[PDB]
């Protein structure tokens, strides 16, 4: 029915993950999802227990599952250690072993939460944009690449199958939202841009259901500050995606609000944007919105349950208004806010 | 003082004319020996000659001390073959003169915070100069090309290329707040890493100037959350295109953003906005970006810094007193130009 690997890891990870589970448990019960999950050691919580960051039962409970609900990893106790044993590269091994080529990051400014944004209210109102970013190609992994005394070079390269697959994801995401996709390239100057555009156009042919439009990267940066509310789904290569999803991530005005999904060949991974936050670890104050919204994401993208995920979304939106956490100017601790999410979910 | 005026298309002529009106006034007051000549460029040139950058305009440009440039393009030209695009005309202008350094200041004038997309508290005091490398990087790098299977472009810089654009930004910061942010991707890319190490090497020649490094993705967050923290920013061609474009929307009207392009040949001065065909020939275009560009011209082409700052004084005051329509006021191009000229006369007869 619903098989889930839970990797809470380090710091606030365990706390915010436990919060998501309450929500998932509340759902399973009232809706009958047949939720099956197990908990797996990960990051520094595993380096202490299995001399490794991403160990034997975890590697395999990952392959076995239909989805991975990740907390966050790293901390104070684990600083300045090898690329071998590093928590932050356990993340990279996890993400690679599943061949995850697409990163989906939504920035939503919730009703009533306009004041938080660094944009003026008028501009901030009604922003909900899903940036989809190609993740295993582009300039970051392109060749030729090198450096000498005299110069350095790097290659932004994309092949047809790399653009196609990421574009379908974005197209499939659009079918479940508002049926509008914007594709981002540098088509007026670069051969890769023009190749990107044309391929996404070819893929679009199979989705006349979805409105498709093309924006250049430099002008996309003007639009996300000037009128971000105009967008639904946005798809782009790796470096532009990095740049523009980071840009969009600031629009809501709190890091604790940001969920992430990573899709591909293997087992999908849902996780908060934020880190293990050892500065506020175990003070009972960590805002679980990001992990819960990661659980929502897990429902829509790994299991087909789109109406259910919108329920979790609507529950979370109402709670942020009613009992805002400290990072929002509010006063509600993790526990009390989760209970607020459940009151709304029980209605 | 020998200028080549390249008015261009749409509002281009309109706003360039207002810039000239400010210049003739200055020439009268101060005795500049201003000499200028008007050349076809962009769509205008395509209609008369079939190419965006004719030999006659190439020669005018080569032979003057500065170019004052409006803007190019419009529906009549936009989707044309490449050899003859308004856009290609631009690249040809910049390459001919080898203008490697694109200087783009974004300023929220005292009292104009309400205009910004950003909350008043965050737009307050913003004044950031993006120094963008203009002749190199991924946009001109080889190998490049496309087949049915794949496509590739090459982000690459060499040492003397990073060095000279670096020098320009340190010299710029030295006449400002003495703070440079260099921007790379040193954490993932070889080119980032080389960019960074080379800027540090140039930084040692400017001990009075504080030098800091930021990744492009991070910069992009920082320019929205805390843009007022920055003085000078220096970066490559694509990151510069992106970040300076981002910064250009912070003031809240593209009517307000001037720019300079400086290199080996004749420097080019131009508003950041396009040809605004929605409003062209309606007499409402804001001439600020053009007037400020002519002020950049006076400092960087002619060493008339105190004049350039006076011009910026008269503009800032006029913005407040009689705002143009893009600021919520009613002041047409000419009416606004007059207000500027009156504050210029008034501040000078003191
Ligand atoms: N995606 C990731 O897993 C990730 C990302 C960045 C950093 N890290 C790692 O985590 C550790 C901390 O680095 P960091 O502090 O820059 O990342 P961080 O997200 O933990 O810290 C960001 C800041 O925002 C606050 N914050 C973060 N999440 C919050 C939440 N859910 N509710 C309320 N406040 C919240 C933190 O207290 C901190 O001041 C480091 O070891 C770093 O390497 C991990
Ligand atoms: N430097 C350049 O030459 C340059 C830059 C950008 C676009 N373009 C070209 O110009 C056209 C672009 O039209 P566009 O709408 O995308 O960009 P645009 O900058 O011309 O217009 C953007 C918006 O700002 C308004 N606006 C711009 N300048 C103004 C001013 N000085 N005063 C008052 N309002 C102003 C316009 O009316 C429009 O609504 C195309 O042909 C494009 O190729 C040229
Ligand atoms: Mn990033
Ligand atoms: Mn641009």
């Amino acid at each position: 029915s619903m098989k889930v690997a839970v990797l809470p890891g380090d710091g606030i990870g365990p706390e915010v993950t436990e919060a998501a589970l309450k929500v998932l448990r509340a759902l399973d019960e009232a809706e009958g999802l047949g939720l099956a999950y197990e908990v797996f050691p990960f990051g520094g919580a595993a380096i202490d227990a299995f001399g490794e960051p991403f160990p034997e039962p975890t590697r395999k409970g990952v392959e076995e599952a239909e989805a991975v609900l990740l907390g966050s990893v790293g901390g104070p106790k684990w600083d300045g250690l090898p690329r071998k044993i590093r928590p932050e590269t356990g993340l990279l091994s996890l993400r690679k072993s599943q061949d995850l080529f697409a990163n989906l990051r939504p920035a939503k400014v919730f009703p009533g939460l306009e004041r938080l944004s660094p944009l003026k209210e008028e501009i901030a109102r009604g922003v909900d944009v899903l940036i989809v970013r190609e993740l295993t190609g582009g300039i970051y992994f392109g060749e030729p690449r090198g450096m000498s005394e005299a110069e350095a070079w790097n290659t932004e390269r994309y092949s047809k199958p790399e653009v196609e697959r990421v574009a379908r994801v974005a197209f499939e995401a659009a079918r479940k939202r508002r049926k509008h996709v914007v594709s981002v390239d540098k088509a007026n100057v670069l051969e890769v841009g023009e190749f990107w555009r044309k391929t996404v156009e070819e893929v679009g042919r199979g989705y006349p259901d979805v409105a498709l439009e093309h924006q250049y990267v430099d002008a996309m940066a003007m639009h996300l500050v000037r009128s971000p509310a105009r967008f639904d789904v946005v798809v782009t290569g790796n470096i532009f995606g990095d740049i523009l999803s980071d840009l969009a991530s600031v629009l809501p005005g709190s890091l604790g609000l940001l969920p992430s999904a990573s899709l591909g060949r293997g087992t999908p991974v849902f996780e908060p944007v934020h880190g293990s936050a050892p500065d506020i670890a175990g003070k009972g104050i960590a805002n679980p919105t990001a992990a819960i919204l990661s659980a929502a994401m897990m429902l829509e993208h790994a299991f087909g349950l789109v109406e259910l995920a919108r329920k979790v979304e609507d529950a979370v939106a109402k709670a942020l208004l009613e009992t805002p956490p400290p990072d929002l100017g509010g006063s509600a601790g993790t526990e009390a806010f989760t209970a607020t999410v459940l009151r709304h979910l029980a209605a």
Side-chain angles (χ1 to χ4, degrees), chain A residues 2-347:
Chain A
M2 179 165 297
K3 217 193 170 163
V4 181
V6 195
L7 288 55
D10 304 301
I12 55 160
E15 307 183 63
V16 293
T17 299
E18 178 45 55
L21 299 167
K22 279 153 153 52
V23 180
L24 282 173
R25 294 195 301 256
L27 275 164
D28 188 45
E29 209 227 336
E31 296 283 344
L33 315 174
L35 177 67
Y37 75 81
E38 234 187 11
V39 187
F40 297 105
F42 189 62
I47 290 148
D48 285 38
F50 277 102
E52 274 181 50
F54 184 42
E56 198 273 292
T58 314
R59 264 193 326 280
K60 207 198 68 189
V62 163
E63 217 85 359
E64 276 185 15
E66 300 177 49
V68 173
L69 173 71
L70 177 67
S72 265
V73 293
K77 190 179 185 159
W78 309 287
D79 284 309
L81 296 154
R83 185 206 282 272
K84 190 206 187 82
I85 216 157
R86 186 155 124 217
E88 216 77 38
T89 43
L91 270 177
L92 285 165
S93 271
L94 172 67
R95 287 189 269 244
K96 210 202 81 221
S97 76
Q98 305 314 297
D99 181 30
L100 302 172
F101 59 78
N103 186 59
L104 276 73
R105 286 169 63 185
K108 206 170 181 204
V109 170
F110 292 96
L113 264 54
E114 287 78 19
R115 136 206 62 122
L116 282 196
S117 184
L119 305 164
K120 294 202 158 76
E121 272 199 298
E122 312 295 20
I123 292 145
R125 205 194 326 278
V127 165
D128 172 10
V129 44
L130 182 62
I131 317 281
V132 186
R133 164 185 167 197
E134 205 290 315
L135 211 63
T136 56
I139 192 139
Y140 294 166
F141 306 95
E143 295 186 24
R145 73 192 291 160
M147 151 155 41
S148 72
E149 215 180 53
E151 65 213 310
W153 51 101
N154 272 284
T155 293
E156 168 81 345
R157 163 184 325 283
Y158 274 114
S159 63
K160 200 172 169 58
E162 310 177 80
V163 189
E164 293 180 330
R165 66 178 182 192
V166 80
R168 306 200 163 93
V169 162
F171 276 118
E172 300 284 347
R175 282 191 174 174
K176 298 173 155 177
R177 298 168 53 104
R178 278 172 306 197
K179 332 222 172 203
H180 188 284
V181 176
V182 165
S183 184
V184 185
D185 58 43
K186 189 50 180 164
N188 58 352
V189 187
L190 303 181
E191 281 88 336
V192 162
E194 190 191 319
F195 184 80
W196 184 282
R197 180 168 309 197
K198 147 202 206 89
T199 317
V200 180
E201 274 290 319
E202 200 170 325
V203 186
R205 286 180 204 271
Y207 298 87
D209 188 54
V210 182
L212 168 71
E213 215 192 71
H214 309 275
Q215 278 298 143
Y216 313 116
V217 51
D218 49 315
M220 200 57 209
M222 306 172 68
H223 300 311
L224 288 162
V225 181
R226 203 155 50 167
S227 51
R230 207 249 277 180
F231 302 100
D232 169 37
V233 178
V234 169
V235 62
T236 185
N238 207 332
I239 189 178
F240 301 166
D242 192 11
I243 291 164
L244 296 176
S245 96
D246 290 350
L247 176 44
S249 85
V250 311
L251 306 183
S254 176
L255 195 56
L257 303 157
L258 299 169
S260 140
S262 292
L263 313 176
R265 192 270 315 153
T267 294
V269 179
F270 309 87
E271 75 178 289
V273 157
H274 68 78
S276 84
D279 46 79
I280 58 142
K283 272 168 185 161
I285 66 171
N287 173 8
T289 284
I292 293 158
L293 291 199
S294 288
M297 294 201 83
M298 179 188 82
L299 292 148
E300 146 173 9
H301 289 111
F303 298 111
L305 318 177
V306 166
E307 199 27 55
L308 271 169
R310 296 271 169 282
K311 278 175 90 184
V312 186
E313 248 138 274
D314 197 50
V316 165
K318 306 202 158 222
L320 290 159
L321 267 177
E322 170 169 1
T323 66
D327 62 306
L328 264 55
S331 165
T334 321
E335 208 75 298
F337 178 84
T338 305
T340 305
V341 172
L342 308 187
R343 264 175 272 140
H344 287 300
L345 210 72

Coordinates of all heavy atoms in Angstrom, one line a residue, chain A residues 104-108 126-132 170-183 209-213 220 224 227-235 248 300 310:
Chain A
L104 N 12.6 19.2 -7.4 CA 11.4 20.0 -7.3 C 11.3 20.8 -6.0 O 11.2 20.2 -5.0 CB 10.1 19.1 -7.4 CG 9.6 18.6 -8.8 CD1 10.5 17.6 -9.3 CD2 8.2 18.0 -8.6
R105 N 11.3 22.1 -6.1 CA 11.2 23.0 -5.0 C 10.1 24.0 -5.1 O 10.2 24.9 -5.9 CB 12.6 23.6 -4.7 CG 13.6 22.6 -4.1 CD 15.0 23.2 -4.1 NE 15.1 24.4 -3.2 CZ 16.2 25.1 -3.1 NH1 17.3 24.9 -3.8 NH2 16.2 26.2 -2.3
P106 N 9.1 23.9 -4.3 CA 8.0 24.9 -4.3 C 8.3 26.0 -3.3 O 8.6 25.8 -2.1 CB 6.8 24.1 -3.9 CG 7.2 23.0 -3.2 CD 8.7 22.7 -3.4
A107 N 8.1 27.3 -3.7 CA 8.1 28.4 -2.8 C 6.6 29.0 -2.8 O 6.1 29.6 -3.7 CB 9.1 29.5 -3.3
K108 N 6.0 28.8 -1.6 CA 4.6 29.2 -1.5 C 4.6 30.3 -0.4 O 5.1 30.2 0.7 CB 3.7 28.1 -1.2 CG 2.2 28.3 -1.6 CD 1.4 27.1 -1.6 CE 0.0 27.5 -2.1 NZ -1.1 26.6 -1.5
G126 N 0.0 35.3 -3.2 CA -0.5 34.3 -4.1 C 0.6 33.6 -4.9 O 0.3 32.9 -5.9
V127 N 1.8 33.8 -4.4 CA 3.0 33.1 -5.0 C 3.0 31.6 -4.6 O 3.0 31.3 -3.5 CB 4.3 33.7 -4.5 CG1 5.6 32.8 -4.7 CG2 4.5 35.1 -5.0
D128 N 3.0 30.8 -5.6 CA 3.2 29.4 -5.5 C 3.8 28.8 -6.8 O 3.1 28.6 -7.8 CB 1.8 28.7 -5.2 CG 1.9 27.1 -5.1 OD1 3.0 26.5 -5.2 OD2 0.8 26.6 -5.1
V129 N 5.1 28.6 -6.7 CA 5.8 28.3 -7.9 C 6.7 27.1 -7.6 O 7.5 27.1 -6.7 CB 6.6 29.5 -8.4 CG1 7.3 30.2 -7.3 CG2 7.7 29.0 -9.5
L130 N 6.6 26.1 -8.5 CA 7.4 24.9 -8.3 C 8.6 25.0 -9.4 O 8.3 24.8 -10.6 CB 6.5 23.7 -8.6 CG 7.0 22.2 -8.5 CD1 7.5 21.9 -7.1 CD2 5.9 21.3 -8.9
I131 N 9.8 25.3 -8.9 CA 11.0 25.1 -9.8 C 11.4 23.7 -9.9 O 11.8 23.1 -8.9 CB 12.1 26.0 -9.3 CG1 11.7 27.4 -8.8 CG2 13.2 26.0 -10.3 CD1 11.5 28.4 -9.9
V132 N 11.5 23.2 -11.1 CA 12.0 21.8 -11.4 C 13.4 22.0 -12.0 O 13.5 22.6 -13.1 CB 11.0 21.1 -12.3 CG1 11.3 19.7 -12.6 CG2 9.6 21.2 -11.8
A170 N 8.3 17.9 -15.1 CA 7.7 19.3 -15.1 C 6.4 19.3 -15.7 O 5.4 19.8 -15.1 CB 8.7 20.3 -15.7
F171 N 6.2 18.7 -16.8 CA 4.9 18.5 -17.5 C 3.9 17.8 -16.6 O 2.8 18.2 -16.4 CB 5.0 18.0 -18.9 CG 5.3 19.0 -19.9 CD1 6.5 19.0 -20.7 CD2 4.4 20.1 -20.1 CE1 6.7 19.9 -21.6 CE2 4.7 21.1 -21.1 CZ 5.8 21.0 -21.8
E172 N 4.4 16.7 -16.0 CA 3.5 15.9 -15.1 C 3.1 16.6 -13.8 O 2.0 16.5 -13.4 CB 4.1 14.5 -14.7 CG 4.4 13.6 -15.9 CD 3.2 13.0 -16.5 OE1 2.1 13.0 -15.9 OE2 3.4 12.4 -17.6
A173 N 4.0 17.4 -13.3 CA 3.8 18.2 -12.2 C 2.7 19.3 -12.5 O 1.8 19.5 -11.7 CB 5.1 18.9 -11.7
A174 N 2.9 19.9 -13.7 CA 1.9 20.9 -14.2 C 0.4 20.4 -14.3 O -0.5 21.1 -13.9 CB 2.3 21.6 -15.5
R175 N 0.3 19.1 -14.7 CA -1.1 18.5 -14.8 C -1.9 18.5 -13.5 O -3.1 18.4 -13.5 CB -1.0 17.1 -15.4 CG -0.9 17.1 -16.9 CD -1.1 15.7 -17.5 NE -1.1 15.8 -19.0 CZ -1.1 14.8 -19.8 NH1 -1.2 13.6 -19.4 NH2 -1.1 15.1 -21.1
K176 N -1.1 18.5 -12.4 CA -1.7 18.3 -11.0 C -1.8 19.7 -10.3 O -2.3 19.8 -9.2 CB -0.7 17.5 -10.2 CG -0.4 16.1 -10.7 CD 0.7 15.4 -10.0 CE 0.5 13.8 -10.0 NZ 1.6 13.1 -9.3
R177 N -1.3 20.7 -11.0 CA -1.4 22.1 -10.4 C -2.3 23.0 -11.3 O -3.5 22.7 -11.4 CB 0.0 22.6 -10.2 CG 0.8 21.8 -9.1 CD 2.3 22.2 -9.1 NE 2.4 23.6 -9.0 CZ 2.8 24.2 -7.8 NH1 3.1 23.5 -6.7 NH2 2.9 25.6 -7.8
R178 N -1.7 23.9 -12.0 CA -2.4 24.9 -12.8 C -2.1 24.8 -14.3 O -2.5 25.7 -15.1 CB -2.2 26.3 -12.3 CG -3.0 26.7 -11.1 CD -2.6 28.1 -10.6 NE -1.1 28.1 -10.2 CZ -0.5 29.0 -9.5 NH1 -1.2 30.0 -8.9 NH2 0.8 28.8 -9.3
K179 N -1.5 23.7 -14.8 CA -1.4 23.5 -16.3 C -0.6 24.6 -17.0 O -0.9 24.8 -18.2 CB -2.7 23.2 -16.9 CG -3.8 22.6 -16.0 CD -4.6 21.5 -16.7 CE -5.5 20.9 -15.6 NZ -5.9 19.5 -16.0
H180 N 0.4 25.2 -16.4 CA 1.2 26.2 -17.1 C 2.7 25.9 -16.7 O 3.0 25.8 -15.5 CB 0.9 27.6 -16.6 CG 1.6 28.7 -17.4 ND1 2.9 29.0 -17.2 CD2 1.1 29.4 -18.4 CE1 3.3 29.9 -18.1 NE2 2.2 30.2 -18.9
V181 N 3.5 25.7 -17.7 CA 4.9 25.5 -17.6 C 5.7 26.6 -18.2 O 5.4 27.0 -19.4 CB 5.4 24.1 -18.2 CG1 6.9 24.0 -18.1 CG2 4.7 22.9 -17.6
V182 N 6.7 27.1 -17.6 CA 7.7 28.0 -18.2 C 9.1 27.3 -18.2 O 9.6 26.8 -17.2 CB 7.8 29.3 -17.4 CG1 9.1 30.1 -17.9 CG2 6.6 30.1 -17.7
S183 N 9.6 27.3 -19.4 CA 10.9 26.6 -19.6 C 12.0 27.7 -19.7 O 11.8 28.6 -20.4 CB 10.9 25.7 -20.8 OG 12.2 25.0 -20.9
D209 N -2.5 19.8 -23.3 CA -3.2 20.0 -22.1 C -2.5 21.2 -21.3 O -3.1 21.9 -20.5 CB -2.9 18.6 -21.4 CG -3.6 18.4 -20.1 OD1 -4.9 18.6 -20.1 OD2 -3.0 18.0 -19.2
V210 N -1.1 21.2 -21.4 CA -0.4 22.2 -20.6 C 0.0 23.4 -21.5 O 0.5 23.3 -22.6 CB 0.9 21.5 -20.1 CG1 1.7 22.5 -19.3 CG2 0.6 20.3 -19.2
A211 N -0.1 24.6 -20.9 CA 0.4 25.8 -21.6 C 1.9 25.9 -21.4 O 2.3 25.6 -20.3 CB -0.3 27.1 -21.1
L212 N 2.6 26.1 -22.5 CA 4.1 26.1 -22.4 C 4.5 27.5 -23.0 O 4.0 28.0 -24.0 CB 4.7 25.0 -23.2 CG 6.2 25.0 -23.5 CD1 7.1 24.8 -22.3 CD2 6.6 24.0 -24.6
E213 N 5.5 28.0 -22.3 CA 6.0 29.3 -22.5 C 7.6 29.3 -22.3 O 8.0 28.5 -21.5 CB 5.3 30.3 -21.6 CG 5.0 31.7 -22.1 CD 4.5 32.7 -21.0 OE1 5.4 33.1 -20.2 OE2 3.3 33.0 -21.0
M220 N 14.3 35.7 -16.4 CA 13.5 35.0 -15.4 C 13.8 35.5 -13.9 O 12.9 35.6 -13.1 CB 13.8 33.5 -15.5 CG 12.8 32.6 -14.9 SD 11.1 32.9 -15.6 CE 10.3 32.4 -14.1
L224 N 10.8 36.8 -11.2 CA 10.6 36.2 -9.9 C 10.7 37.2 -8.8 O 10.3 36.9 -7.7 CB 11.6 35.1 -9.6 CG 11.4 33.8 -10.4 CD1 12.7 33.0 -10.4 CD2 10.3 33.1 -9.8
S227 N 7.2 39.8 -10.3 CA 5.9 39.2 -10.4 C 6.0 37.7 -10.3 O 5.5 37.0 -11.2 CB 5.2 39.6 -11.7 OG 6.0 39.3 -12.8
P228 N 6.5 37.2 -9.2 CA 6.6 35.8 -9.0 C 5.3 35.1 -9.1 O 5.2 33.9 -9.4 CB 7.2 35.6 -7.6 CG 7.2 37.0 -7.0 CD 7.3 37.9 -8.1
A229 N 4.2 35.7 -8.7 CA 2.8 35.1 -8.6 C 2.3 34.7 -10.0 O 1.3 33.9 -10.0 CB 1.8 36.0 -7.8
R230 N 2.9 35.1 -11.0 CA 2.5 34.8 -12.4 C 2.9 33.3 -12.8 O 2.4 32.9 -13.9 CB 3.2 35.8 -13.3 CG 2.4 36.0 -14.7 CD 3.2 35.5 -15.9 NE 4.2 36.4 -16.4 CZ 5.0 36.2 -17.4 NH1 4.9 35.0 -18.1 NH2 5.9 37.1 -17.8
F231 N 3.7 32.6 -12.0 CA 4.2 31.3 -12.4 C 3.6 30.2 -11.7 O 3.1 30.3 -10.6 CB 5.7 31.3 -12.3 CG 6.4 32.3 -13.0 CD1 6.9 33.5 -12.4 CD2 6.6 32.2 -14.4 CE1 7.5 34.5 -13.1 CE2 7.3 33.2 -15.1 CZ 7.7 34.3 -14.4
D232 N 3.6 29.0 -12.4 CA 3.1 27.8 -11.8 C 4.3 26.7 -11.7 O 4.9 26.6 -10.6 CB 1.9 27.2 -12.6 CG 1.5 25.8 -12.2 OD1 1.6 25.4 -10.9 OD2 1.1 25.0 -13.1
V233 N 4.6 26.1 -12.8 CA 5.7 25.2 -12.9 C 6.8 25.9 -13.8 O 6.4 26.5 -14.8 CB 5.3 23.8 -13.4 CG1 6.5 22.9 -13.6 CG2 4.3 23.2 -12.5
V234 N 8.1 25.8 -13.4 CA 9.2 26.3 -14.1 C 10.2 25.2 -14.2 O 10.5 24.5 -13.2 CB 9.9 27.5 -13.2 CG1 11.2 27.9 -13.8 CG2 8.9 28.7 -13.1
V235 N 10.8 24.9 -15.4 CA 11.7 23.8 -15.5 C 13.0 24.4 -16.2 O 12.9 25.2 -17.1 CB 11.2 22.6 -16.3 CG1 10.8 23.0 -17.8 CG2 12.1 21.4 -16.3
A248 N 14.0 31.9 -5.7 CA 12.6 31.7 -5.3 C 12.4 31.3 -3.8 O 11.4 31.6 -3.2 CB 12.0 30.7 -6.2
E300 N 1.8 13.2 -3.1 CA 1.5 13.5 -4.5 C 2.4 12.9 -5.5 O 2.0 12.5 -6.6 CB 1.4 15.1 -4.7 CG 1.9 15.7 -6.1 CD 1.6 17.2 -6.2 OE1 1.3 17.9 -5.3 OE2 1.8 17.7 -7.4
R310 N -3.0 17.9 -0.9 CA -3.6 19.2 -0.8 C -4.3 19.4 0.6 O -4.4 20.5 1.1 CB -4.6 19.5 -1.9 CG -4.1 19.5 -3.3 CD -3.6 20.9 -3.8 NE -2.9 20.7 -5.0 CZ -1.6 20.3 -5.1 NH1 -1.0 20.0 -4.0 NH2 -1.1 20.2 -6.3

